[PDB]
Design a protein around this ligand. Structure first.
Ligand SMILES: [Zn+2]
Ligand SMILES: [Zn+2]
Ligand SMILES: [Zn+2]
Ligand SMILES: [Zn+2]
Length: 111
DNA sequence: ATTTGGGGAGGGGTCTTTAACC
DNA sequence: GGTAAAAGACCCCTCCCCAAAT
């Protein structure tokens, strides 16, 4: 789509080029008025504000448990399914978060 | 000692909603 | 109201770091 004017990286996001351009300045223009923590983007600030408000918009359809984050809901759903979602293609290990599998592939030879 | 599980920050994509002009 | 954008809301991922578990 459109290339970044600075680093010439292709930004496929529709209307997301200014958002990427703001990444090069390193500033955090969004701030939580309560705990004074600064954020780069507004959506992260709202998800953080869920921490102060106590809002838990993610609902489990089987037991009604509520969570503030989508990944919390998934990791909880594995209590009903018992399924570890990420599996290594080479060493038979399984993991509960994607970055755990990435870390395993980065560290262990595995093959 | 080493591996797992999770908190909390970042970035990039898509779908919808909206702010700016006209 | 129409148009062409950016913002919002939400999805996914990785990273550092540190308890916790093994
Ligand atoms: Zn750039
Ligand atoms: Zn806060
Ligand atoms: Zn449940
Ligand atoms: Zn492996």
């Amino acid at each position: 789509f459109q290339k970044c004017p600075i680093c010439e990286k292709v930004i496929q996001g529709a209307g997301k080029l200014p958002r990427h351009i703001r990444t090069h300045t390193g500033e955090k223009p969004y701030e939580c008025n309560i705990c004074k923590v600064r954020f780069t983007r507004q959506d992260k600030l709202k998800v953080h504000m869920r921490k102060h408000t106590g809002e838990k918009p993610y609902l489990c359809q089987q037991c009604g448990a509520a969570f503030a984050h989508n990944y919390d809901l998934k990791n909880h759903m594995r209590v009903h399914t018992g399924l570890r979602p990420y599996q290594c293609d080479s060493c038979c290990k399984t993991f509960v978060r994607s970055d755990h599998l990435h870390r395993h592939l980065k560290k262990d030879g595995c093959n």
